[PDB]
Amino acid sequence: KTHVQLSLPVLQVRDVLVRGFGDSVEEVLSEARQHLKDGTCGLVEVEKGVLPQLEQPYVFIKRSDAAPHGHVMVELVAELEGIQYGRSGETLGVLVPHVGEIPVAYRKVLLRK
C-alpha cells in the first residue's frame, strides 16, 4: 500500500532514551521509515525548548492533506543545520525511536510510504 494507518505513541521529551535516528539526513529518514514500519517509532510534540533536547538531524511528520478513519495524512521531512529535505504542511511532531517509554497519548496518522 502507498499509505499505512499508524497510531504513534506520544512521548514526553524528558522521557526519551534515544533522541534521534542517526547521523545523516539519509540515515535518519531511512531509520524513521523502518521504525514506523516495525511499530518502534514515537512522536514528540514540538514546543519551545523541545528540539534543542533532541539530536540532529531531526525527522518531522508534517500534514500532507486537509483524514481517513481519524488518521491525518502525513509525510516525513528531515532537518539539519536549518535546512529541510522535503516540503510539506504543518509539523505534528518530531519522530524518535520508541524503546518502551510510557506515552501520554496516541497520534493517528496515515503515512505516505
UniProtKB/Swiss-Prot annotation:
Localization per record: Host cytoplasm
Name of this protein: Host translation inhibitor nsp1
Parent-protein residues present: 11 to 125 of 7096
Biological source species: Severe acute respiratory syndrome coronavirus 2
Location of the CoV Nsp1 globular domain: 2-113
Chain's role: Inhibits host translation by associating with the open head conformation of the 40S subunit. The C-terminus binds to and obstructs ribosomal mRNA entry tunnel. Thereby inhibits antiviral response triggered by innate immunity or interferons. The nsp1-40S ribosome complex further induces an endonucleolytic cleavage near the 5'UTR of host mRNAs, targeting them for degradation. This inhibits the integrated stress response (ISR) in the infected cell by preventing EIF2S1/eIF2-alpha phosphorylation upstream of stress granule formation and depletes host G3BP1.
Region Disordered, residue ranges: 1-113
